[model samples]
Target chain A: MAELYVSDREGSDATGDGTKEKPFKTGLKALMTVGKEPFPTIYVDSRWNVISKSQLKNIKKMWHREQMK
Target chain B: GHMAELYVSDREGSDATGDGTKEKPFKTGLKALMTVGKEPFPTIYVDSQKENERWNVISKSQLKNIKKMWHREQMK
Candidate 1:
């Protein structure tokens, strides 16, 4: 049940694993990571900087799809 | 980039309406916890004088990992 953190100007989707030291450029990207843990929350910076349209839609959709967790 | 400040108080806030503002705040750790991942992360304060809140179960666990990451950042 470990949630994730993401930022735009201050992160790297290429190198970060969503840790505070190395965050993902997109919170949506971190949320899409399928793993043993459930990323229930996506820690967005104050502005949520770059959470564009597509990911926002996916996020809202994914929240209701009910995965087999 | 949008500029703003969000807050969370276990006992005094809302998850939806308040929109995470200090005056309104979020009621759960999950909601408030969602904004700590910024590179130039915002510095938070809990009125050191105010009693630390009694955290919820999942949030209490989640904060563990957040703390770990925070410490690692300090080490770097």
Candidate 2:
């Protein structure tokens, strides 16, 4: 239920906790971390970019799983 | 159930039936916005340069509607 942050300018999936000062590296990482949580606001900076193939697959998988509910 | 997520990339020739993948994304920001109510409350991810540039240009009514949609579930 917390606001997750992601910014390409200042983010690191290896260490970030989705805070503004220490944002997650990618939207995928943020989404994974907040799985099944209530509608949390995800603040993605404009600097954020591309989703790798593996990340895309994982997101699709996540979405499909949710849809099956 | 968890809320859905949406991926929008204008670079791709998107369609309404699109599953919101990078390969077959929503063509315009409006297309994706329109889906807010129809689809689950989606956490939208815009990967399109054009869409991002025009993101701030949405009308006040449009913004109000979108905001209403996002907050609708919370009130339930």
Candidate 3:
């Protein structure tokens, strides 16, 4: 596991590789990218509205941890 | 002496009397903004995802009001 960055306002899942410079658009998309593997630490840089509770639950299934700041 | 942070979440009810914290989050961004006034330059965090969980959806005008205040403070 690695650390990943996510931002709904500044992210682009199409081009993002989870780096701060290239963050995924949504936490769900980032989780999908990490599929079947242990979840990495996710740093959320935007509003919490980017993902829903069910989506968060799905992400939690693969969870290592999450940070919102 | 200054505010360190202010918390707002639609999931929780807004309380002017409450100390701004995650557990006793303000009901709206506007309330938090009003509570902060134009001083301190504290960080404001909002739980934007909790509208369904009882969080108040912050309106654009409300957000604009906060931004305007911040800008005014910067200009002063």
Candidate 4:
């Protein structure tokens, strides 16, 4: 599963690679490339977001399915 | 989805991590439901609300799809 990183402060839809260094401006921008580019996981930098333990665990489950191997 | 069971031992339970076994019970029903498996809704053996929650439906339709009911059980 390819990981796509998204950021608002430094992300732009144009010339986007969805990498940690060059993330997209918005999640919808990442969504635009979701099916065609095979990006299953999207990382958003949340300077103000905090998730509970269960939510965090659930997110990990979503992105960490490769552990079955 | 097939029916499944979960064990919720209060003492040994750890929310967001337990596999829903009496030996590995979930600390809260929120964690129990959040802990999704093959079963869409699991039969939870709860003691008390760890988070002081009421289990409000995040969505009304999901509440309708609910099959199993969670209730208190004696771990002893």
Candidate 5:
């Protein structure tokens, strides 16, 4: 139940069909569907939220709860 | 606006060091621990160099920092 919370600030949008190509418009929307137990991966976009891939790896390390396992 | 510098090795088996560029990019921040305690924790900018990737790591705290920095920078 590791949920990722994204803010519904001015920059976020949820207009797309929720796919990589046409990602959801809002960061909150993207985060909402995440953390459902198995394979809960969330991608949030924001001018202030620039998560590097490396840091993400570290964050994942912090969360020992693996959706794959 | 504090950055932690560390040596990063990609899981893809790349032997990159120092420069944070794609082919030679540092893959992880934990590598910074290797130099930790060796001296006063130095503030160095660290970036995750992913090709075709335009985003960087943004933790909850980091996002707040970014917002603050952006605001402050704009003020100046």
Candidate 6:
């Protein structure tokens, strides 16, 4: 099934269970999610100005996905 | 008493080279922190600046705590 990954910098996980309701954990975890056809959307809860190179690359790859916006 | 001053800069105004002086200081969180923590076990203290709106909003302590957590996680 298609999924979305989201997380907050304050250490909050948006997804844990495999169900759509539980979602994935942090945006970082979402970025690392595997085995999903096409990439999943990742949402963040708070404002974060600093990010690592890997994160920037992951988000940039998803920029074209319609659900990301 | 020698006071450790806390100066917060507007997110947009933070430049890498700001000297933390009255005329050219940008509130680089890391820079301000280094100033206070440069020595071993430095007891840092700061007050809210009433005249400048930018310095008062950020919680330097909170930011520092987050930094500590980040460091700890790295060690794990």
Best by lDDT: 3
- What tens-digit string does per-residue lDDT give for candidate 4 at A1-69? 377776544665576678777776544345445444233555655542333444345434432332232
- Residue pairs of candidate 6 with colliding backbone atoms: A15-A23, A15-A24
Q: Give the DockQ-based CAPRI class for model 1.
A: incorrect
Q: Write the per-residue lDDT of candidate 2 for residues A1-69, one digit (tens) a residue.
A: 467676644666668888878987555456556556363566655454443343344444443443332
My TM-score estimates for the predictions, one after another, are 0.33, 0.36, 0.35, 0.30, 0.26, 0.31
Error of 6 at B14 (Å): 3.3
lDDT of each: 0.48, 0.50, 0.54, 0.47, 0.37, 0.39
lDDT of 2 by residue, B5-72 (tens): 66655344354456564456664333454456554446655542353452223334434444543444
DockQ, cand. 1? 0.04
TM-score of 1: 0.33
Question: lDDT tens digits, residues A1-69, model 5?
Answer: 232333322222344444544554333234334554353444444433444454455444423322333
Candidate 3 ranges with C-alpha deviation above 4 Å = A46-56, A62-69, B1-76
A1-69, model 6: which lDDT tens digit per residue?
454534322332322642335544333234434444465444333343333333445344433331331
lDDT of 1 by residue, A38-57 (tens): 43456655444443343444
Write down the TM-score for model 3: 0.35
Least accurate 10 contiguous residues by lDDT in model 4 chain A: A60-69
Superposed model 6: Cα runs more than 4 Å off: A1-69, B1-3, B39-54, B60-76
Higher-ranked by lDDT: 4 or 5: 4
Enumerate residue pairs that collide in model 2. Answer: none
Whole-model lDDT for model 1 versus the true structure?
A: 0.48
Q: For residues B1-76, could you state the per-residue lDDT of candidate 1 as single tens digits? A: 5235445543355455545666776543333445455545443322122246432222233345445434443443
* DockQ (Cα-based) for each candidate: 0.04, 0.02, 0.02, 0.09, 0.08, 0.06
Model 5 ranges off by over 4 Å: A1-36, A44-58, A65-69, B1-39, B46-76
Which DockQ-derived CAPRI band holds candidate 6?
incorrect
Give the alpha carbon lDDT tens digit for every residue of B1-76 in model 3: 5467767654444444455676787644434554565564466665555435433334354355555544543443
